[PDB]
Every structure is written in structure tokens, then in C-alpha cells.
């Protein structure tokens with residue numbers, strides 16, 4: 093109920109975000125858990141600041157679309173961080 | 183790197199790397215800030231007296247990626263070879279090498295909000311992560 097326009101926009105960034113996440117090769121990270129978080133948050137800031145110019149509508153709905161996106165980007169990032177988290181012990 | 187992945191890199195870099203050479207000192211700084219760890223040692227560029235070296239360096243990064251991206255088909259070990267040079271001769275830890283690429287991609291997302299698209303970033307990130315050694 094936010095807008096048939098930004099509704100799909102948010103869906104696009106989450107697909108694009110998955111191919112990004114899914115193409116990651118852990119054997120090639122050598123980055124700590126601490127910095128992997130930084131990297132991912134930069135990737136999310138990135139998408140938000142990107143679609144911030146793509147969201148359409150009025151301010152009320154504007155901030156609303158972004159907020160849902162970030163909520164979703166995290167939902168994908170969380171499993172990612174966990175799997176990577178379980179790349180230390182292993 | 184699939185035949186399609188390579189076509190996307192050339193496209194991506196084509197439309198976004200034209201001024202990459204101007205973001206040396208900035209990508210370096212983003213790294214020092216976002217990743218403080220890389221800041222404890224860093225005996226490079228003689229920063230104490232300058233910005234000239236990290237600036238010139240920023241040019242080499244862009245030029246190298248340009249050459250490397252233009253030759254993904256024929257010279258798949260360009261980045262690999264370059265990375266080894268840093269890791270084995272220049273005293274540059276592969277993670278700093280990897281992080282500066284990230285901070286360089288971040289800088290570009292800053293300076294080019296409508297060109298630096300999600301797909302443009304994934305297509306470049308995939309190329310940059312192809313720093314292993316190919317055979």
C-alpha cells in the first residue's frame with residue numbers, strides 16, 4: 093500500500109542485491125567479520141542512496157519506500173553475514 | 183568470469199571509470215576511516231609530506247583497471263599478477279588491495295549517482311574479486 097511504482101523498485105534492488113550477495117566467494121575475503129559488516133553496510137547505504145533518486149511520490153511515501161527497502165536489504169544480508177560468520181570457525 | 187560477466191565489466195567500466203583516476207586520495211581516506219585497522223601500519227606514500235604520491239597512485243589504479251578490463255578475455259591474470267606484485271614486492275597486504283577497490287567503488291557511487299547502478303557495481307565487484315590466479 094505504498095505505491096505500485098516504488099513497490100517494484102524496492103523489489104528490483106533486492107534482486108540486484110542478491111546477485112551481488114550470491115556471487116561472493118568467501119575463499120576470497122581475508123577480511124574480518126568486523127570489516128565484512130562495514131563492507132555490507134556500505135553496499136546497503138549504496139543501494140539506499142541510489143534508489144533515493146528512484147523512489148517516486150510525495151515525501152511521506154518517499155521516506156516510506158526507502159525504509160522498507162533497508163528493512164528488506166537487511167533480511168537478505170543477515171543470512172549472508174551468518175554464513176560468512178560460519179566461515180571463521182570452519 | 184563468464185562470457186557475459188566480461189561483457190558487463192567493459193560496459194560498467196566504460197560508463198563509470200572515466201574519472202576514476204581522480205579519486206586516489208579519497209578512496210584511500212575512505213579506507214582509513216571505514217577500516218581503521220589498515221591505518222595502524224601503512225608505511226606507504228610518505229603521507230607525512232604529501233598527497234602527490236597517493237594522487238599519482240590513484241592514476242595507476244584507474245589506468246590498470248582500464249587496461250585489465252579491456253583485456254579480460256586475453257589477459258585474465260592482469261589483476262592477479264598486479265595483486266601478487268603488491269603482496270610479494272610492494273608490502274601491500276591483499277586485504278588492503280581488496281579494500282581500496284571497495285573504497286574506490288564507493289567513491290564512484292558518490293560521484294556518479296545515476297551511472298553507478300546496482301548492476302554496474304555488481305559487474306565491477308565480480309571483476310575485482312577475480313584476483314585469484316587463473317588457469
Ligand code: HEM
Nearest residue numbers: 226227239242243246247268272274278279280282283286
Ligand atoms: C585497488 C587496488 C589497487 C590497484 C588496482 C593498484 C594498482 C597499482 C599499480 C598499477 C601500480 C604501479 C605498479 C608498477 O610499478 O608496475 C601500483 C603501485 C603501488 N601501489 Fe597499488 N594498487 C591498488 C591498491 C594499493 C593499496 C591498497 C596500496 C597500499 C597503500 C597500494 C600501494 C602501492 C605502492 C606503495 C605502489 C608503488 C607506487 C609507486 O611508487 O608508483 N596499492 N599500484
